[PDB]
Design a protein around this ligand. Structure first.
Ligand SMILES: [Zn+2]
Ligand SMILES: [Zn+2]
Ligand SMILES: [Zn+2]
Ligand SMILES: [Zn+2]
Lengths: 71, 74
DNA sequence: CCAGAACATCAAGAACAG
DNA sequence: CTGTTCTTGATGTTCTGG
């Protein structure tokens, strides 16, 4: 019943596994406009309801990594 | 011959609340400075703040400030 | 020159529309 | 569900009085 990216709330399957409302919207806007998001630390940046915004780079790869795509 | 931000690195504005800050940094501080922002760091309070990633970790940023010795006036 | 106020952006997460 | 638009907090850049 929970997201597999941020771990918050699941809304359904989108471009792959379960995602939160935002993780859905994020993944697209993100992977499409190809923006080299660079982590600010050591890439392990824990992502969740509270922090997911803090670092697109880490969030984004968590997507590809946890299975996700555009088609 | 260029003055640089002691916090973000962007083009420095002036001596604000304590040090050579960038435009935003000045403001950024004052706002959060005294307020319940409750910013949360991602990793270990040791991120690297530069003009293009200052938005990422507020916590670290502000902390860097307090560390650089900024202030409002006690 | 600087601390603030005032006016202007960005972008994330929610609410919609098809 | 997926594509698009709206709302709003967090930020940024100008404009002001002392
Ligand atoms: Zn999520
Ligand atoms: Zn990160
Ligand atoms: Zn700065
Ligand atoms: Zn941080």
């Amino acid at each position: 019943k929970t997201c597999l990216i941020c771990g918050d709330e699941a809304s359904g399957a989108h471009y792959g596994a379960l995602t939160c409302g935002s993780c859905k919207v994020f993944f697209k806007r993100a992977a499409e406009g190809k923006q080299k998001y660079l982590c600010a630390s050591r890439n392990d940046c824990t992502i969740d309801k509270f922090r997911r915004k803090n670092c697109p780079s880490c969030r984004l790869r968590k997507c590809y990594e946890a299975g996700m795509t555009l088609g």
